[PDB]
Amino acid sequence: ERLCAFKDPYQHENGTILCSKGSTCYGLWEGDINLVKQGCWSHIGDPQECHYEECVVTIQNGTYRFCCCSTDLCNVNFTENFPP
Amino acid sequence: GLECDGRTNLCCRQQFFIDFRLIGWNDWIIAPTGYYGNYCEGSCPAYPGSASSFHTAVVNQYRMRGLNPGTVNSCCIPTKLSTMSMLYFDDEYNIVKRDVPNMIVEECGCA
């Protein structure tokens, strides 16, 4: 089990979550970039997406930023680092 | 269980990516962009312990004489399924995350 950041305005006392065994952390942000959702991402079976030490972001609005990462609470900040 | 390598035609698990981009669903599903749903393909035996070996002799005798016995062959089917996390739009434009079960085939086997 892993502890992840949590936030859900759709229907966090201290901001922790017990994930089922084998799950990871995720986070979704939306203009002026504020958070929409955080929690447990139990989608393994596609390690092209959830193999990260920290939260990494890679028709869509183009405004949304989704990540998943492996460690505790890593879904609090993301980063983009593409080579030019 | 067998993994499909493209060589054997035995009951195996073939990797299959479902792209929400190709089916035009990336507008209401935010994440994932797609997933390896996979599927089962390949051949299986005719479908025990000691009595099933007796049926073996009956089948072989009927086939030997040009008759046809119970051609109840087995089927290549998923034996192990995993759940998948999905992040998508709700019908009222609210953001709903739901872990949809039985989405990814992880092993195949004969029925």
Author numbering:
A (entry chain E): 31 to 41, 53 to 71, 75 to 102, 108 to 133
B (entry chain A): 293 to 339, 344 to 407
Authors' description from the paper:
Among type II receptors, TGFβR2 and AMHR2 only interact functionally with a select number of GFs, whereas ACVR2A, ACVR2B, and BMPR2 are promiscuous and can form signaling and nonsignaling complexes with an overlapping group of over 30 GFs, including homodimeric and heterodimeric activins, inhibins, bone morphogenetic proteins (BMPs), growth and differentiation factors (GDFs), Nodal, and Lefty. Structural and biochemical studies have revealed that the GF-binding domain (GBD) of both type I and type II receptors adopt a similar, “three-finger toxin fold”, where the “fingers” refer to three pairs of antiparallel β-strands that form an extended β-sheet.
To determine how BMPR2 and its GBD variants interact with GFs, we solved the crystal structure of BMPR2-GBD in complex with activin B, a GF that can bind BMPR2 (28, 35) and that signals via BMPR2 in some cell types. We solved the BMPR2 complex by placing the activin B protomer structure predicted by AlphaFold first. The asymmetric unit of the BMPR2 complex comprised three receptor and three GF protomers, where all biological dimers were related by crystallographic symmetry. BMPR2 binds activin B at its “knuckle epitope”, a convex surface on the GF that is formed by a set of antiparallel β-strands or “fingers”. Its GF-binding interface is similar to that of ACVR2A and consists of a concave surface that harbors a hydrophobic hot spot containing three conserved aromatic residues, Y67, W85, and F115, at its center. By contrast, BMPR2 exhibited significant variability in loop regions and in areas that were not directly involved contacting the GF, possibly reflecting the intermediate-binding affinity of BMPR2 for activin B and the conformational plasticity of the GF-free BMPR2 structures. In fact, loop conformations in the GF-free structure would preclude GF binding, supporting the idea that these loops adopt distinct conformations in the GF-free and GF-bound forms. We also observed a second, substantial interface, which results in the formation of a GF hexamer. Notably, type I receptors interact with the wrist helix at the GF dimer interface and this feature is occluded in the hexameric activin B complex.
